[PDB]
Design an enzyme around this catalytic site. Structure first.
Site, PDB file in Angstrom:
ATOM      1  N   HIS A  11       0.818  -1.206   0.000  1.00 17.17           N
ATOM      2  CA  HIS A  11       0.000   0.000   0.000  1.00 17.17           C
ATOM      3  C   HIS A  11       0.861   1.270   0.000  1.00 17.17           C
ATOM      4  O   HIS A  11       0.335   2.371  -0.203  1.00 17.17           O
ATOM      5  CB  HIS A  11      -1.078  -0.032   1.091  1.00 17.17           C
ATOM      6  N   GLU A  36      19.202   6.762   8.552  1.00 12.75           N
ATOM      7  CA  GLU A  36      18.498   7.937   9.091  1.00 12.75           C
ATOM      8  C   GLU A  36      18.209   7.872  10.585  1.00 12.75           C
ATOM      9  O   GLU A  36      17.810   6.825  11.107  1.00 12.75           O
ATOM     10  CB  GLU A  36      17.161   8.168   8.370  1.00 12.75           C
ATOM     11  N   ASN A  51      17.240  11.669  12.404  1.00  8.03           N
ATOM     12  CA  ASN A  51      16.406  12.823  12.071  1.00  8.03           C
ATOM     13  C   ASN A  51      16.235  12.903  10.557  1.00  8.03           C
ATOM     14  O   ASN A  51      17.208  13.152   9.828  1.00  8.03           O
ATOM     15  CB  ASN A  51      17.026  14.106  12.624  1.00  8.03           C
ATOM     16  N   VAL A 100      17.278  16.425   8.995  1.00 10.17           N
ATOM     17  CA  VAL A 100      18.619  16.971   9.148  1.00 10.17           C
ATOM     18  C   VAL A 100      19.636  15.956   8.641  1.00 10.17           C
ATOM     19  O   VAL A 100      19.534  14.781   8.986  1.00 10.17           O
ATOM     20  CB  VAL A 100      18.931  17.290  10.631  1.00 10.17           C
ATOM     21  N   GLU A 137      23.765   8.959   6.629  1.00  7.87           N
ATOM     22  CA  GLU A 137      22.795   8.673   5.579  1.00  7.87           C
ATOM     23  C   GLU A 137      23.388   8.056   4.319  1.00  7.87           C
ATOM     24  O   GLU A 137      24.530   8.349   3.933  1.00  7.87           O
ATOM     25  CB  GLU A 137      22.060   9.946   5.164  1.00  7.87           C
ATOM     26  N   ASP A 143      -0.161  -7.500   1.885  1.00  7.41           N
ATOM     27  CA  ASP A 143       0.363  -6.131   1.887  1.00  7.41           C
ATOM     28  C   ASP A 143       1.876  -6.126   2.045  1.00  7.41           C
ATOM     29  O   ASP A 143       2.435  -5.836   3.125  1.00  7.41           O
ATOM     30  CB  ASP A 143      -0.319  -5.310   2.979  1.00  7.41           C
ATOM     31  N   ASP A 172       0.865   1.942  19.915  1.00 12.91           N
ATOM     32  CA  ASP A 172       0.547   1.391  18.589  1.00 12.91           C
ATOM     33  C   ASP A 172       1.438   2.029  17.525  1.00 12.91           C
ATOM     34  O   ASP A 172       2.052   3.070  17.764  1.00 12.91           O
ATOM     35  CB  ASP A 172      -0.929   1.712  18.277  1.00 12.91           C
ATOM     36  N   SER A 173       1.488   1.427  16.341  1.00 11.69           N
ATOM     37  CA  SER A 173       1.972   2.142  15.162  1.00 11.69           C
ATOM     38  C   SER A 173       0.861   3.062  14.637  1.00 11.69           C
ATOM     39  O   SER A 173      -0.289   3.012  15.115  1.00 11.69           O
ATOM     40  CB  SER A 173       2.443   1.168  14.079  1.00 11.69           C
ATOM     41  N   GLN A 203      -0.187   6.326  11.279  1.00 13.99           N
ATOM     42  CA  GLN A 203       0.033   6.840   9.939  1.00 13.99           C
ATOM     43  C   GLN A 203       1.490   7.299   9.771  1.00 13.99           C
ATOM     44  O   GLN A 203       2.046   8.001  10.616  1.00 13.99           O
ATOM     45  CB  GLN A 203      -0.968   7.960   9.632  1.00 13.99           C
ATOM     46  N   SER A 254       3.660   2.971   8.167  1.00 11.12           N
ATOM     47  CA  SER A 254       3.348   1.896   7.206  1.00 11.12           C
ATOM     48  C   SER A 254       4.571   1.448   6.438  1.00 11.12           C
ATOM     49  O   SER A 254       5.399   2.272   6.041  1.00 11.12           O
ATOM     50  CB  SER A 254       2.279   2.335   6.214  1.00 11.12           C
TER      51      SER A 254
HETATM   52 CA   LIG Z   1      19.009  12.592   8.521  1.00 12.68          CA
END
Ligand SMILES: [Ca+2]
Length: 223
Positions: free
Chosen positions: A40, A52, A54, A57, A62, A84, A171-172, A174, A177
């Site tokens: 989804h 990652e 933040n 920033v 990264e 899914d 919980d997880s 929005q 996902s």
């Molecule tokens: Ca970052």
């Protein structure tokens, strides 16, 4: 993640952010070239962001790598959210070290009662909206299939499990996902769906990764 804690930078080294100009979903690095996420979450123009903390920033660990291909599960149904799961291939292999690392696929399915780690950059509020910039974590048990089906009559397939707390509060949510549910060092779930977040008797529903290991392995072997 509602009711969780700040993970700490690069403490969840397989956690990725899927980015098209903004974070929109999580994912899990399963080897140097491939990410597992939720079907989804599919869209074109995905850049995978590894290492990652933040997401707003540049902090120094990264790796930003564009996707070359996405493969949504052949039987994904967007109405029921059955199957899914999606694979995303990186245009170039990530560089693996302690802060950026793949997570193993399960050898067997995890059972109700097993503790898992769920993580993501999703909403931290059950009512209203607040997005964290750093990665959030939640320890949560897998719930029985019976309690899962009781919570969501007529909606839980053999490719889903519930995890979390029937009391609500944790919980997880929005924006989480596609991200990982890891139990005993294995990727056992993908953040999939639920009714709001952290509501009483509405726990999170997760894609049951152990059902997909053969498809994942075969797909990677030929793509
Ligand atoms: Ca970052």
């Amino acid at each position: 993640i509602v009711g969780g804690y700040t993970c700490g930078a690069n403490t969840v080294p397989y956690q990725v952010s899927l980015n098209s100009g903004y974070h929109f979903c999580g994912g899990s690095l399963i080897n140097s070239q491939w990410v597992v996420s939720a079907a989804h979450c599919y869209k074109s123009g995905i850049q995978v962001r590894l290492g990652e903390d933040n997401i707003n920033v540049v902090e120094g660990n990264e790796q930003f790598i564009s996707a070359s291909k996405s493969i949504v599960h052949p039987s994904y149904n967007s109405n029921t959210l059955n199957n899914d799961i999606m694979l995303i291939k990186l245009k170039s292999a990530a560089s693996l070290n302690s802060r950026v690392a793949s997570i193993s696929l399960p050898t067997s399915c995890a059972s109700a009662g097993t503790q898992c780690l769920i993580s993501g950059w999703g909403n931290t509020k059950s009512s209203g909206t607040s997005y964290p910039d750093v990665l959030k974590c939640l320890k949560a048990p897998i719930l029985s299939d019976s309690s899962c089906k009781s919570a969501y009559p007529g909606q839980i397939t053999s490719n889903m499990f519930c995890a979390g707390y029937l009391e609500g509060g944790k919980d997880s949510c929005q924006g989480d996902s596609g991200g990982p549910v890891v139990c005993s060092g294995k990727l056992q779930g993908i953040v999939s769906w639920g009714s709001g977040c952290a509501q009483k008797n509405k726990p999170g529903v997760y894609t049951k990764v152990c059902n997909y290991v053969s498809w994942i392995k075969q797909t990677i072997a030929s793509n």
